[PDB]
Amino acid sequence: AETKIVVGPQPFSVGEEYPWLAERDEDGAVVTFTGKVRNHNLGDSVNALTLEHYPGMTEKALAEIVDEARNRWPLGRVTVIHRIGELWPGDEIVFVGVTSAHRSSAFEAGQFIMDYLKTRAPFWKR
Template sequence: MTVRVQTEDFDLTTEVAALRAQNPKVGAVACFVGTVRDLNEGRTVETMELEHYPGMTEKSLEGIVNAARERWPGIDVLIVHRVGKLYPLDQIVLVATTSAHRGHAFASCEFVMDYLKSHAPFWKKERTESGEHWVDARVTDDAALERWGLSSGNAKAQ
């Protein structure tokens, strides 16, 4: 299990190769890379700044990984999440999961990302042409989590 919160960018190829090298039984890798969009809710995004609580954030992400591993025994998970000031096209987050077969790899990757969007303690502030504002949580993020039998009130990432 690997969880990192960092300011520097990550290299997808390097990260996936390192994750795969840990287990010769891996038959499938699923990845999600989230990036900064140039437009959000009709406003042009100039920058996005992500803040977090060091220590607390990593513990929360580790709890998400543990929840995924309980559902899909045998998977491995990598989460790399950036913080600090980012610009459109910059990478924000990498979630990669490995499994013996593709079904568990795809499902666990989506589960981790859905859980992360709803429960990881990150705060986003966007700068647009109209100034700075904090980005609110989206109803669609909670709906995605509900597909897994979880809600904002009962999901626990310890």
């Protein structure tokens, strides 16, 4: 069961990520989450969200969240992508994909990974 972890400034495309994620026949249940910049992430009028990461450490922390999810649920392929840089309301900034034999596992793991990425993975906002 492969894991893909990428962090960078470029737009990602779910259509380009999904086929790898869902490739394996034994991965019968496929869950994705895409998170975009909200208008509440700003709240005032529109200036940009600027996100920075810590090269190496951010990806490590993401890797460790996925490992932890794999200790709790029987997961197949997992992808975690996080965009950084200057971002605006409506931009796709995070993608988590998880597979499993059971849908419950995929749903619960997908949520676990997002929850922990939001509270543990080191990013700096401004």
